[PDB]
Amino acid sequence: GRDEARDAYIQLGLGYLQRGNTEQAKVPLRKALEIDPSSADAHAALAVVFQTEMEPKLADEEYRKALASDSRNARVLNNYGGFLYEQKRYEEAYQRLLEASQDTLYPERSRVFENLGLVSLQMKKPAQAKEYFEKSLRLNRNQPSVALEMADLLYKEREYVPARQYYDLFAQGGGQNARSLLLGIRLAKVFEDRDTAASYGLQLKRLYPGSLEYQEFQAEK
Amino acid sequence: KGRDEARDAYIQLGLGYLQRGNTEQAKVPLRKALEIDPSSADAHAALAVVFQTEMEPKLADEEYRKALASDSRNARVLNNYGGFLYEQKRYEEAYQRLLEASQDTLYPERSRVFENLGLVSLQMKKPAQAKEYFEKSLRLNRNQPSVALEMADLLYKEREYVPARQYYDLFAQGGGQNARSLLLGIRLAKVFEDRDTAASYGLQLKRLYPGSLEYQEFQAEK
Q1: Å from B99 to nearest chain A CA?
Q2: Which end of chain B is more exposed for a tag (fewer CB within 10 A), N or C?
Q3: Contact assessment for residue A138 and residue A170, using Cβ atoms and an 8 Å cutoff
């Protein structure tokens, strides 16, 4: 057929998937595949469908089919990498992410670098992780989640001043959690900021009354 | 610290023998470096090319791996190893080592890393991907006739004659020419109705590569 039709069908499938209906999304995706059996995007969309229907082996197959095409696959590589990650296939996830990072035109390139840092952490390679988080920030400094990873790593290495800078950077994204609040409390205390320590503690004591962090906060309080 | 001074010196002596073509002699100095520092990545790496040069792939592979055990992210060694893997036709592994090599953006020869990613892509039957890698290599180092030639060939095959010709001319102003490139230049001249070069290249080709498949095709007025 033609790319327009194929692409129209692919988005139809996505729209359905991007809203829970996966058994359905499959009909427009398969139409896309009838038009272009090699469509990397059609196969990738299908991979995410099976991935959603907790069918790992089917998802892996679709992802590999999409990678077989000689097209710009950074997005596909990044999603496959995420998939390999939850499948605990870390070394593989890392390789696909390295390949996804090659595309400088890809809008999510800095997220690809964040993912490289994340996977490096799972592999117990903190030093390369830091490097990857730093590369992500060099592309775009305003990514709270990445700054949080930097703050956490620097904090564990006792490099408190740089850690605080990154934590402050993360804090202006206003997206706390048990982990971020506890890191905030601990940093606040190194810099003797009782106001922040007390404040975050409440958000913790209130938003995550049960969490281990709350316990630690209580014990370090 | 003194021990590192002698080790480094021996590694340089070894690389000098290699560079001078005395491949086998390079081993003496390199084993000394290794006797001083059993885990020296640069000594293992140099020994690796000694073996690679002597067509002893098992030994070369083992030395490349020992060199990377030390520092698994050393771009120079990752690139030499991926280059080795490419020659051994172990494309998946070459690609993987080269992808890791590409991450050191301060590596002076990063342009070579991208050239290698492009060549490996060719063998994986992904010419559009090879092209992107080749363009990255030329952006980092414009003066690479061999990369310009691979670009010219790809563009020619894509019917993108003007960009093809452009890259070809850049390759030509670099010296070399072989059966392959003479034929490519001949076919490009024909497209841009340049009878002079077409007849001239066909000359160098009949003269220097009379037994090549390229000359055979040329005669078929190809």
Answers
A1: 6
A2: N
A3: no
Backbone dihedral angles phi then psi of residue A191, each to the nearest 5 degrees? -95, 20
Q: How far apart are CA B71 and CA A60, in angstroms?
A: 32
Cβ-contact B135, B151 below 8 angstroms: yes
Copy the structure tokens of residue A19: 């809203």
Residue in the block written with tokens 């030395």: B63
Residue A152 to residues A53, A183, A187, A215, B205: CA-CA distances in angstroms? 34, 7, 10, 19, 65
Tell me the structure's resolution in angstroms, rounded to a single decimal: 2.0
Q: Which CATH number fits domain A1-221: 3.40.50.150, 1.25.40.10, 1.10.287.600, 1.20.1250.20?
A: 1.25.40.10
Class of domain B1-222: mainly alpha
User: Method used for this model?
Assistant: X-ray
Partner residue facing A70 (CB), from B96, B117, B126: B126
Which member of B99, B117, B129 has the closest CB to residue A70? Answer: B129
| Identity of the residue numbered A131 | E
A71 touches chain B (CB under 8 A): yes
The Cβ-side half-sphere exposure at A149, using a 13 Å CA radius, reads 27
Measured between alpha carbons, how far is A111 from A101 in angstroms, rounded to an integer? 9
- How many residues are listed for chain B in this entry? 222
